[PDB]
Design an enzyme around this catalytic site. Structure first.
Site, PDB file in Angstrom:
ATOM      1  N   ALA A  44       0.608  -1.308   0.190  1.00  0.00           N
ATOM      2  CA  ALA A  44      -0.163  -0.100  -0.117  1.00  0.00           C
ATOM      3  C   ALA A  44       0.898   1.078   0.004  1.00  0.00           C
ATOM      4  N   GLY A  60       6.982  -7.241   2.380  1.00  0.00           N
ATOM      5  CA  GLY A  60       7.584  -6.050   2.295  1.00  0.00           C
ATOM      6  C   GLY A  60       8.357  -5.852   3.463  1.00  0.00           C
ATOM      7  N   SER A 113      19.726 -11.864  12.369  1.00  0.00           N
ATOM      8  CA  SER A 113      19.879 -11.942  13.705  1.00  0.00           C
ATOM      9  C   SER A 113      18.814 -13.038  14.580  1.00  0.00           C
ATOM     10  N   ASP A 143     -18.900  19.436 -25.274  1.00  0.00           N
ATOM     11  CA  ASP A 143     -17.522  19.528 -26.085  1.00  0.00           C
ATOM     12  C   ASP A 143     -16.493  18.791 -25.079  1.00  0.00           C
ATOM     13  N   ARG A 158      12.579  -8.377   8.827  1.00  0.00           N
ATOM     14  CA  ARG A 158      12.522  -8.411  10.318  1.00  0.00           C
ATOM     15  C   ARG A 158      11.894  -7.145  10.847  1.00  0.00           C
ATOM     16  N   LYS A 159      12.100  -5.834  10.324  1.00  0.00           N
ATOM     17  CA  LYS A 159      11.534  -4.768  10.778  1.00  0.00           C
ATOM     18  C   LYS A 159      10.006  -4.646  10.775  1.00  0.00           C
ATOM     19  N   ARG A 198     -26.775  17.466 -25.190  1.00  0.00           N
ATOM     20  CA  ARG A 198     -27.068  17.592 -26.485  1.00  0.00           C
ATOM     21  C   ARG A 198     -25.726  17.517 -27.251  1.00  0.00           C
ATOM     22  N   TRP A 240     -18.266  32.583 -18.915  1.00  0.00           N
ATOM     23  CA  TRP A 240     -19.438  33.039 -19.670  1.00  0.00           C
ATOM     24  C   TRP A 240     -19.126  34.228 -20.497  1.00  0.00           C
ATOM     25  N   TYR A 261     -29.699  28.781 -18.650  1.00  0.00           N
ATOM     26  CA  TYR A 261     -29.881  27.669 -17.816  1.00  0.00           C
ATOM     27  C   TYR A 261     -30.727  28.382 -16.589  1.00  0.00           C
ATOM     28  N   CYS A 277     -26.604  23.014 -23.451  1.00  0.00           N
ATOM     29  CA  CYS A 277     -25.984  21.698 -23.813  1.00  0.00           C
ATOM     30  C   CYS A 277     -26.402  20.865 -22.975  1.00  0.00           C
ATOM     31  N   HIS A 278     -26.896  20.882 -21.858  1.00  0.00           N
ATOM     32  CA  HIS A 278     -27.071  20.073 -20.731  1.00  0.00           C
ATOM     33  C   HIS A 278     -28.714  20.266 -20.789  1.00  0.00           C
ATOM     34  N   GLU A 319     -20.500  28.717 -10.979  1.00  0.00           N
ATOM     35  CA  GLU A 319     -21.271  28.843 -12.128  1.00  0.00           C
ATOM     36  C   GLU A 319     -22.744  27.794 -11.810  1.00  0.00           C
TER      37      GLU A 319
HETATM   38  N1  LIG Z   1       2.504   0.222   3.575  1.00  0.00           N
HETATM   39  C1  LIG Z   1       2.912  -1.107   3.393  1.00  0.00           C
HETATM   40  O1  LIG Z   1       2.359  -1.955   2.530  1.00  0.00           O
HETATM   41  C2  LIG Z   1       4.056  -1.616   4.089  1.00  0.00           C
HETATM   42  C3  LIG Z   1       4.705  -0.719   4.940  1.00  0.00           C
HETATM   43  N2  LIG Z   1       5.783  -1.199   5.698  1.00  0.00           N
HETATM   44  C4  LIG Z   1       6.458  -0.504   6.525  1.00  0.00           C
HETATM   45  O2  LIG Z   1       7.991  -0.352   6.097  1.00  0.00           O
HETATM   46  C5  LIG Z   1       8.805  -0.089   7.235  1.00  0.00           C
HETATM   47  C6  LIG Z   1       9.666  -1.425   7.401  1.00  0.00           C
HETATM   48  O3  LIG Z   1      10.633  -1.516   6.367  1.00  0.00           O
HETATM   49  P1  LIG Z   1      12.095  -1.458   6.355  1.00  0.00           P
HETATM   50  O4  LIG Z   1      12.417  -0.268   6.931  1.00  0.00           O
HETATM   51  O5  LIG Z   1      12.388  -1.795   4.891  1.00  0.00           O
HETATM   52  O6  LIG Z   1      12.397  -2.924   7.062  1.00  0.00           O
HETATM   53  P2  LIG Z   1      11.980  -4.370   6.524  1.00  0.00           P
HETATM   54  O7  LIG Z   1      10.434  -4.504   6.801  1.00  0.00           O
HETATM   55  O8  LIG Z   1      12.682  -4.381   5.351  1.00  0.00           O
HETATM   56  O9  LIG Z   1      13.201  -5.079   7.507  1.00  0.00           O
HETATM   57  C7  LIG Z   1      14.463  -4.938   7.605  1.00  0.00           C
HETATM   58  C8  LIG Z   1      15.183  -6.025   8.118  1.00  0.00           C
HETATM   59  O10 LIG Z   1      15.073  -7.291   7.051  1.00  0.00           O
HETATM   60  C9  LIG Z   1      16.282  -8.017   7.277  1.00  0.00           C
HETATM   61  N3  LIG Z   1      16.926  -7.968   5.901  1.00  0.00           N
HETATM   62  C10 LIG Z   1      16.800  -7.038   4.880  1.00  0.00           C
HETATM   63  N4  LIG Z   1      17.577  -7.618   3.886  1.00  0.00           N
HETATM   64  C11 LIG Z   1      18.308  -8.513   4.345  1.00  0.00           C
HETATM   65  C12 LIG Z   1      19.445  -9.173   3.866  1.00  0.00           C
HETATM   66  N5  LIG Z   1      19.831  -9.209   2.415  1.00  0.00           N
HETATM   67  N6  LIG Z   1      20.103 -10.274   4.345  1.00  0.00           N
HETATM   68  C13 LIG Z   1      19.504 -10.487   5.663  1.00  0.00           C
HETATM   69  N7  LIG Z   1      18.742  -9.778   6.212  1.00  0.00           N
HETATM   70  C14 LIG Z   1      17.987  -8.871   5.696  1.00  0.00           C
HETATM   71  C15 LIG Z   1      17.236  -7.370   8.180  1.00  0.00           C
HETATM   72  O11 LIG Z   1      16.882  -7.736   9.526  1.00  0.00           O
HETATM   73  P3  LIG Z   1      17.928  -8.138  10.737  1.00  0.00           P
HETATM   74  O12 LIG Z   1      18.158  -6.476  11.011  1.00  0.00           O
HETATM   75  O13 LIG Z   1      17.384  -8.938  11.794  1.00  0.00           O
HETATM   76  O14 LIG Z   1      18.947  -8.535   9.806  1.00  0.00           O
HETATM   77  C16 LIG Z   1      16.788  -6.016   8.064  1.00  0.00           C
HETATM   78  O15 LIG Z   1      17.037  -5.166   9.246  1.00  0.00           O
HETATM   79  C17 LIG Z   1       7.714   0.391   8.477  1.00  0.00           C
HETATM   80  O16 LIG Z   1       7.481   1.553   8.529  1.00  0.00           O
HETATM   81  C18 LIG Z   1       6.684  -0.508   7.912  1.00  0.00           C
HETATM   82  O17 LIG Z   1       5.598  -0.234   8.758  1.00  0.00           O
HETATM   83  C19 LIG Z   1       6.067  -2.583   5.678  1.00  0.00           C
HETATM   84  C20 LIG Z   1       5.421  -3.467   4.978  1.00  0.00           C
HETATM   85  C21 LIG Z   1       4.593  -3.000   4.232  1.00  0.00           C
HETATM   86  C1  LIG Z   2     -19.241  22.621 -19.645  1.00  0.00           C
HETATM   87  C2  LIG Z   2     -19.459  23.918 -19.182  1.00  0.00           C
HETATM   88  C3  LIG Z   2     -19.758  25.411 -18.945  1.00  0.00           C
HETATM   89  N1  LIG Z   2     -19.142  26.245 -19.885  1.00  0.00           N
HETATM   90  C4  LIG Z   2     -20.330  27.016 -20.423  1.00  0.00           C
HETATM   91  C5  LIG Z   2     -19.954  27.007 -22.152  1.00  0.00           C
HETATM   92  C6  LIG Z   2     -20.592  27.953 -22.834  1.00  0.00           C
HETATM   93  C7  LIG Z   2     -20.287  27.875 -24.307  1.00  0.00           C
HETATM   94  C8  LIG Z   2     -19.531  27.205 -24.807  1.00  0.00           C
HETATM   95  N2  LIG Z   2     -19.199  27.047 -26.193  1.00  0.00           N
HETATM   96  C9  LIG Z   2     -18.332  26.116 -26.695  1.00  0.00           C
HETATM   97  N3  LIG Z   2     -18.067  26.086 -28.082  1.00  0.00           N
HETATM   98  N4  LIG Z   2     -17.890  25.073 -25.896  1.00  0.00           N
HETATM   99  C10 LIG Z   2     -18.103  24.892 -24.473  1.00  0.00           C
HETATM  100  O1  LIG Z   2     -17.663  24.057 -23.822  1.00  0.00           O
HETATM  101  C11 LIG Z   2     -18.961  25.869 -23.969  1.00  0.00           C
HETATM  102  C12 LIG Z   2     -19.159  26.005 -22.687  1.00  0.00           C
HETATM  103  C13 LIG Z   2     -17.814  26.367 -19.957  1.00  0.00           C
HETATM  104  C14 LIG Z   2     -16.939  27.291 -20.831  1.00  0.00           C
HETATM  105  C15 LIG Z   2     -15.854  27.526 -20.832  1.00  0.00           C
HETATM  106  C16 LIG Z   2     -14.885  26.734 -19.900  1.00  0.00           C
HETATM  107  C17 LIG Z   2     -13.447  26.957 -19.713  1.00  0.00           C
HETATM  108  O2  LIG Z   2     -12.844  27.637 -20.746  1.00  0.00           O
HETATM  109  N5  LIG Z   2     -12.847  26.224 -18.686  1.00  0.00           N
HETATM  110  C18 LIG Z   2     -11.592  26.271 -18.231  1.00  0.00           C
HETATM  111  C19 LIG Z   2     -10.986  27.762 -18.404  1.00  0.00           C
HETATM  112  C20 LIG Z   2     -11.635  28.718 -17.439  1.00  0.00           C
HETATM  113  C21 LIG Z   2     -11.219  28.368 -15.749  1.00  0.00           C
HETATM  114  O3  LIG Z   2     -10.147  27.993 -15.614  1.00  0.00           O
HETATM  115  O4  LIG Z   2     -12.197  28.439 -15.104  1.00  0.00           O
HETATM  116  C22 LIG Z   2     -10.559  25.355 -19.180  1.00  0.00           C
HETATM  117  O5  LIG Z   2      -9.768  25.967 -19.817  1.00  0.00           O
HETATM  118  O6  LIG Z   2     -10.609  24.151 -18.810  1.00  0.00           O
HETATM  119  C23 LIG Z   2     -15.541  25.940 -19.239  1.00  0.00           C
HETATM  120  C24 LIG Z   2     -17.002  25.577 -19.211  1.00  0.00           C
HETATM  121  C1  LIG Z   3       3.067  -6.734   6.991  1.00  0.00           C
HETATM  122  N1  LIG Z   3       1.951  -5.655   7.372  1.00  0.00           N
HETATM  123  C2  LIG Z   3       2.156  -4.395   7.114  1.00  0.00           C
HETATM  124  C3  LIG Z   3       1.311  -3.939   6.046  1.00  0.00           C
HETATM  125  C4  LIG Z   3       0.139  -3.181   6.140  1.00  0.00           C
HETATM  126  N2  LIG Z   3      -0.626  -2.864   5.229  1.00  0.00           N
HETATM  127  C5  LIG Z   3      -0.342  -3.524   3.935  1.00  0.00           C
HETATM  128  N3  LIG Z   3      -1.050  -3.174   2.976  1.00  0.00           N
HETATM  129  C6  LIG Z   3      -0.791  -3.797   1.882  1.00  0.00           C
HETATM  130  N4  LIG Z   3      -1.647  -3.518   0.780  1.00  0.00           N
HETATM  131  N5  LIG Z   3       0.076  -4.527   1.752  1.00  0.00           N
HETATM  132  C7  LIG Z   3       1.011  -4.906   2.518  1.00  0.00           C
HETATM  133  N6  LIG Z   3       1.999  -5.539   2.442  1.00  0.00           N
HETATM  134  C8  LIG Z   3       0.656  -4.354   3.858  1.00  0.00           C
HETATM  135  N7  LIG Z   3       1.826  -4.559   4.580  1.00  0.00           N
HETATM  136  C9  LIG Z   3       0.854  -6.037   7.972  1.00  0.00           C
HETATM  137  C10 LIG Z   3       0.546  -7.564   7.497  1.00  0.00           C
HETATM  138  C11 LIG Z   3      -0.647  -8.067   8.022  1.00  0.00           C
HETATM  139  C12 LIG Z   3      -1.679  -7.108   8.810  1.00  0.00           C
HETATM  140  C13 LIG Z   3      -2.715  -7.961   9.343  1.00  0.00           C
HETATM  141  O1  LIG Z   3      -3.358  -7.393  10.430  1.00  0.00           O
HETATM  142  N8  LIG Z   3      -3.225  -8.780   8.570  1.00  0.00           N
HETATM  143  C14 LIG Z   3      -4.585  -9.502   8.923  1.00  0.00           C
HETATM  144  C15 LIG Z   3      -5.613  -8.658   8.440  1.00  0.00           C
HETATM  145  C16 LIG Z   3      -6.557  -8.022   9.561  1.00  0.00           C
HETATM  146  C17 LIG Z   3      -7.750  -7.636   9.178  1.00  0.00           C
HETATM  147  O2  LIG Z   3      -8.630  -8.422   8.432  1.00  0.00           O
HETATM  148  O3  LIG Z   3      -7.961  -6.284   9.520  1.00  0.00           O
HETATM  149  C18 LIG Z   3      -4.427 -10.851   8.267  1.00  0.00           C
HETATM  150  O4  LIG Z   3      -5.406 -11.555   8.662  1.00  0.00           O
HETATM  151  O5  LIG Z   3      -4.050 -11.052   7.412  1.00  0.00           O
HETATM  152  C19 LIG Z   3      -1.288  -5.853   9.180  1.00  0.00           C
HETATM  153  C20 LIG Z   3      -0.079  -5.457   8.800  1.00  0.00           C
END
Ligand SMILES: NC(=O)C1=CN([C@@H]2O[C@H](COP(=O)(O)OP(=O)(O)OC[C@H]3O[C@@H](n4cnc5c(N)ncnc54)[C@H](OP(=O)(O)O)[C@@H]3O)[C@@H](O)[C@H]2O)C=CC1
Ligand SMILES: C#CCN(Cc1ccc2[nH]c(N)nc(=O)c2c1)c1ccc(C(=O)N[C@H](CCC(=O)O)C(=O)O)cc1
Ligand SMILES: CN(Cc1cnc2nc(N)nc(N)c2n1)c1ccc(C(=O)N[C@@H](CCC(=O)O)C(=O)O)cc1
Ligand SMILES: NC(=O)C1=CN([C@@H]2O[C@H](COP(=O)(O)OP(=O)(O)OC[C@H]3O[C@@H](n4cnc5c(N)ncnc54)[C@H](OP(=O)(O)O)[C@@H]3O)[C@@H](O)[C@H]2O)C=CC1
Ligand SMILES: C#CCN(Cc1ccc2[nH]c(N)nc(=O)c2c1)c1ccc(C(=O)N[C@H](CCC(=O)O)C(=O)O)cc1
Ligand SMILES: CN(Cc1cnc2nc(N)nc(N)c2n1)c1ccc(C(=O)N[C@@H](CCC(=O)O)C(=O)O)cc1
Ligand SMILES: O=c1ccn([C@H]2C[C@H](O)[C@@H](COP(=O)(O)O)O2)c(=O)[nH]1
Ligand SMILES: O=c1ccn([C@H]2C[C@H](O)[C@@H](COP(=O)(O)O)O2)c(=O)[nH]1
Lengths: 508, 510
Positions: free
Chosen positions: A9, A112, A76, A413, A54-55, A410, A303, A329, A389-390, A281
């Site tokens: 995510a 991840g 570790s 544009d 691990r993290k 109708r 306009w 309108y 138009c609308h 508008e």
């Molecule tokens: N938004 C999402 O989907 C997710 C977000 N996250 C977030 O990411 C962050 C964690 O990620 P990050 O900081 O990368 O940590 P990681 O989850 O990648 O874990 C890092 C650890 O993994 C082990 N590791 C990594 N590479 C190697 C390697 N080549 N050889 C041996 N061990 C390795 C090491 O553990 P050791 O130190 O024990 O050697 C390292 O410290 C957190 O903020 C978490 O919340 C995490 C997952 C998903």
């Molecule tokens: C749909 C509808 C309502 N309208 C009314 C309206 C009236 C006469 C028309 N006449 C023609 N020939 N085409 C149109 O789309 C049109 C639209 C609009 C008119 C202009 C812009 C326009 O130039 N919009 C911005 C610039 C201005 C701004 O940043 O606010 C742009 O360039 O995107 C948008 C909508």
């Molecule tokens: C590893 N991790 C961090 C995390 C958080 N969001 C993520 N989101 C996405 N999309 N992908 C990931 N890898 C991810 N990872 C996790 C992993 C599992 C759960 C967890 O609670 N999982 C439950 C789901 C709980 C629930 O149903 O809400 C499960 O059953 O798998 C949370 C964080």
């Protein structure tokens, strides 16, 4: 041979996956998703293996996962023996051998720690990436998801979801390596024989070079694709035409788009959209206003041109003061059929109030089938600076008490107007939902003349090269009493991370 | 292994394929199709072999087919090495034998004669059937394509085509004996659905279950536009939410849906149930003439607007003061006299209100590419005086670059069971009329539904309908070029090749 998948995510813009040994957020749906994907398997007497660093092990209480075997990578950690659902290796490479053997291991997931992801991708062990894109980006991160390598291509992208106002995608990538043949062979041979006569030929599939994020073949669920694929279909099949404006267009007729509004707000992410102007508008429509100066006063020039002295002069309305757009309108919405004289006169009480009747019917008689707003007034068109138009919009209270909208347009544009209508009716619908006691449901837009102005081709092609990102959320900071009381300030955009604004000149 | 396919063209209802040693028709697209399907191959060093009975070989003049090898099954014809592109065999079974013989043979086609078809099917030699369904019956046939065995299912059905007014139609059947694009995506979408339930829009638009989906084995080839109507039907049947309404009769409803129909090669008249085509034409031109008198319809034995034009109904809704079958300024009043003042259905309204249908015509003719060809019936000022507020609320028209006229219609509320088949037919016809009068050809009809619902007293009727595989659409041609759009008359219309299933009775919701 056995499948290896990453599961992560990450924040949409910078792939922030961690801070201070924990996550940047809590999102349960994502844990649930993690649970479903990592548990999923066919033969139920095998277990999937979850590899982690691990993290990360450290990070979830060193507490084992139900029904799955954890594999911790560490220098570790003692290779223990108390627990058989948790095993330890000194390096990622040896942790595989998972593959070879444990036929009691169906699938392998890389779960991840950055350090672990980085190793799996570098040593080319992973086949698939399931990526949960999280839309929050101005917060501290100390841990990142590495850049997806070129060997990978996106093949799915879900709709946007919401949790406590945070938008997120999920999304699948496949390491690349390089229906019936009969049904397609037939359809093609009939296509050769029939030519223009077979409707399939009139509606050709867009070419890879104009289809946004092409590798995504069967998982185009993000509703922004509904907008982008429309753009491609016209790029692909649109007929070239001249129109009243100097500038010609590529056009096709009869299209549709759909957007969810329960989980997010459909403001396009492939170009920064002028949400303020859109909103501004809209209340102007709502208030029944046809005085263009009111928009200009709030610094919204949308306009301007259709109200300039020259434009109104060119079209027969030279009698009008600059910016009296006539009964467009807003006026048809609150004063349907009223007799229009000038933007200065007082129209309180004249004409049908559609918008008020809409709200009344919408709260009193929800399941009834007449919730309709229309601007298409045959008797007014010639006094409007532009016909609408609308044109018509139908509203729908679901059994479970959301409000959906259908807009018939109708003449969207696609480059400028369309992204506006999407946002506009989204908001109109959310506004009506607060005011009437419902939740927002769905928005469907039906288009007539769907076209692109030729001076937008390169710009829109730029847009088509940007992969969409989760839609943002849109919330109202207060409950209003009348719908005309909404103000820009009331409005909260959460999580909007668009690509640069793309400049496009409006054809007058 | 090595494919054996039957290729045949047969009459839609009785499977006629031949009369007096010849075809009962002449349709060259079909011969083009035949030729494409039978020439088609990967390896430029192998050839396809077409198998046929002697009499069929007599039929084609005894001349070889370019690029292929003809195999003639005869008792009597000589096995003479003269033509390397034609070989005779004393029996079908031996000729099958193409299968291991001639590594030079890529694919095999059984090209027919009834006796070769019957044999190939009885002896279970054959894997696939390419079938062209020709929509003319009531002519003489003396040869038939056998009934297709239950071991075959249909897997593709094209849109309908037209040649010299004959409708036709390509389908494939596969011998099937003993989602999915791959696992990972359907699994993920499935898991998501479980996590989210109703919160994922995908769960809100669930796919129809097999037992409600028409002709289910056609899964990737539902090209026939009839399917646009049928699949909509199955979709509300699978997701439609229950709701009570103004009628005592409740509905199952979804919101926002669409259908497309071609009109260049056929007329979109549902074949899965006999449709009241006359009553449709008669209402339609009633609307075009701008008429609101319910009587004119009853006088022509069209009773669709009876229930809504009666004394009680007019009463119950507050229009007690109205003459029987004075329906009010409904559809055609708004098309011809938009916003005019409604006196009675007897007054003359010449010159009152905006005449939309006239402006439309002028605009299609003079400003074809303009985007303002719009017909509207939704008049908030006039709903209350209307016996019934309009369902086909708004329509747009569109002149293609190759001079075809297309129509879009927005329908706020639509009785799938009863009104929808009327709307499709109705607006296809209007568009065809508009096209003649304006100098164009029919293009496409798209239909946007707001409230798409099935009445509950309709479920079994529509379930019956859903079990009938559609047939190619008929043709509809105008017998003469009218000078004005309101001159059309039922007599002017010819419906060629309409072969429906029996009519299905459904009660109207008053
Ligand atoms: N938004 C999402 O989907 C997710 C977000 N996250 C977030 O990411 C962050 C964690 O990620 P990050 O900081 O990368 O940590 P990681 O989850 O990648 O874990 C890092 C650890 O993994 C082990 N590791 C990594 N590479 C190697 C390697 N080549 N050889 C041996 N061990 C390795 C090491 O553990 P050791 O130190 O024990 O050697 C390292 O410290 C957190 O903020 C978490 O919340 C995490 C997952 C998903
Ligand atoms: C749909 C509808 C309502 N309208 C009314 C309206 C009236 C006469 C028309 N006449 C023609 N020939 N085409 C149109 O789309 C049109 C639209 C609009 C008119 C202009 C812009 C326009 O130039 N919009 C911005 C610039 C201005 C701004 O940043 O606010 C742009 O360039 O995107 C948008 C909508
Ligand atoms: C590893 N991790 C961090 C995390 C958080 N969001 C993520 N989101 C996405 N999309 N992908 C990931 N890898 C991810 N990872 C996790 C992993 C599992 C759960 C967890 O609670 N999982 C439950 C789901 C709980 C629930 O149903 O809400 C499960 O059953 O798998 C949370 C964080
Ligand atoms: N609509 C369509 O798609 C098609 C229509 N047709 C039409 O069908 C008709 C021809 O079909 P059909 O009348 O059935 O004739 P066939 O084309 O099936 O030919 C019949 C002949 O095939 C030979 N034959 C058949 N079975 C055997 C056997 N078991 N052993 C030896 N020889 C055998 C015999 O020739 P011999 O007498 O020399 O022994 C027999 O007389 C014509 O109208 C033709 O135009 C044909 C193909 C396609
Ligand atoms: C659309 C529209 C106009 N209308 C007017 C009209 C008035 C009230 C309505 N009320 C409801 N609830 N649904 C409707 O579709 C409806 C339609 C129609 C009404 C009935 C039939 C109908 O029963 N048609 C034939 C049976 C009669 C015949 O054979 O001619 C059928 O069963 O198909 C069709 C159209
Ligand atoms: C056997 N037969 C009768 C006939 C007619 N229509 C059919 N149609 C179908 N679908 N299937 C058949 N088996 C079939 N058979 C034939 C076969 C070939 C030709 C023929 O002239 N074929 C040329 C046609 C070329 C062309 O017109 O383009 C070819 O190259 O295949 C005519 C009649
Ligand atoms: O919500 C809106 C406001 C109007 N327009 C544009 C579409 C057309 O480019 C123009 C009207 O063109 P004509 O129908 O007047 O030709 O206004 C939109 O696309 N959407
Ligand atoms: O052209 C038409 C004429 C009216 N109806 C039907 C649709 C609805 O079933 C009914 C009106 O229902 P309510 O809006 O009154 O609930 O009339 C049509 O479908 N099409």
């Amino acid at each position: 041979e056995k499948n290896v998948s990453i599961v992560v995510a990450a924040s949409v813009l910078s792939s922030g996956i961690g801070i201070n040994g924990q996550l940047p957020w809590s999102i349960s749906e994502d844990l649930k998703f993690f649970s479903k994907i990592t548990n999923n398997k066919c033969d139920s007497n095998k277990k999937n293996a979850l590899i982690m660093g691990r993290k990360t092990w450290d990070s979830i209480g060193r507490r084992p996962l139900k029904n799955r075997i954890i594999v911790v990578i560490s220098s570790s950690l003692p290779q223990d023996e108390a627990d058989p659902n948790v095993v330890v290796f000194r390096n990622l490479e040896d942790s595989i051998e998972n593959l070879m053997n444990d036929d009691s291991i169906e699938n392998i997931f890389v779960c991840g720690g950055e350090s672990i992801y980085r190793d799996a991708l570098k040593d080319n062990f992973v086949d698939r990436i399931y990526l949960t894109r999280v839309a929050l980006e101005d917060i501290e991160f100390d841990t990142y998801f590495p850049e997806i390598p070129e060997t990978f291509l996106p093949v799915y992208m879900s709709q946007t979801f919401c949790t406590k106002n945070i938008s997120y995608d999920f999304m699948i990538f496949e390491k690349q390596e390089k229906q019936l043949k009969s049904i397609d062979d037939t359809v093609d041979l009939l296509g050769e024989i029939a030519g223009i006569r077979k409707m399939g030929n009139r509606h050709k599939f867009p070419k890879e070079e104009i289809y946004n994020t092409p590798s995504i073949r069967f998982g185009r669920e993000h509703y922004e694709f509904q907008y982008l694929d429309l753009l491609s279909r016209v790029l692909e099949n649109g007929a070239y035409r001249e129109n009243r404006t100097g500038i010609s267009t590529y056009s096709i007729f009869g299209q549709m788009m759909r957007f969810d509004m329960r989980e997010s707000f459909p403001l396009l992410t492939t170009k920064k959209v002028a949400i303020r102007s859109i909103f501004e508008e809209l209340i102007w429509f709502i208030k029944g206003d046809t005085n263009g100066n009111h928009l200009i006063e709030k610094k919204v020039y949308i306009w301007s041109g259709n109200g300039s002295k020259e434009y109104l002069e060119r079209i027969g309305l030279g009698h009008r003061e600059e910016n009296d757009l006539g009964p467009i309108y807003g006026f048809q919405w609150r004063h349907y059929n009223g007799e229009y004289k000038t933007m200065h006169d007082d129209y309180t009480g004249v004409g049908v109030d559609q918008l008020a009747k809409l709200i009344e019917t919408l709260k009193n008689n929800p399941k009834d089938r007449r919730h309709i707003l229309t601007a298409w007034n045959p008797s007014a068109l010639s006094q409007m600076a532009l016909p609408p138009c609308h044109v018509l919009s139908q509203y729908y209270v679901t059994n479970d008490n959301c409000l959906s909208c259908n807009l018939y347009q109708r003449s969207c544009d696609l480059g400028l107007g369309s992204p506006f209508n999407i946002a506009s009716y989204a908001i109109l619908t959310m506004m009506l939902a607060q005011v009437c006691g419902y939740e927002p449901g769905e928005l469907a837009i039906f288009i007539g003349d769907a076209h692109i102005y030729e001076n937008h081709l390169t710009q829109l092609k730029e847009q088509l090269s940007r992969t969409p990102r989760p839609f943002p959320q849109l919330k109202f900071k207060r409950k209003v009493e009348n719908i005309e009381d909404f103000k820009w300030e009331d409005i909260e955009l959460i999580g909007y991370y668009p690509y640069p604004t793309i400049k496009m000149d409006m054809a007058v």
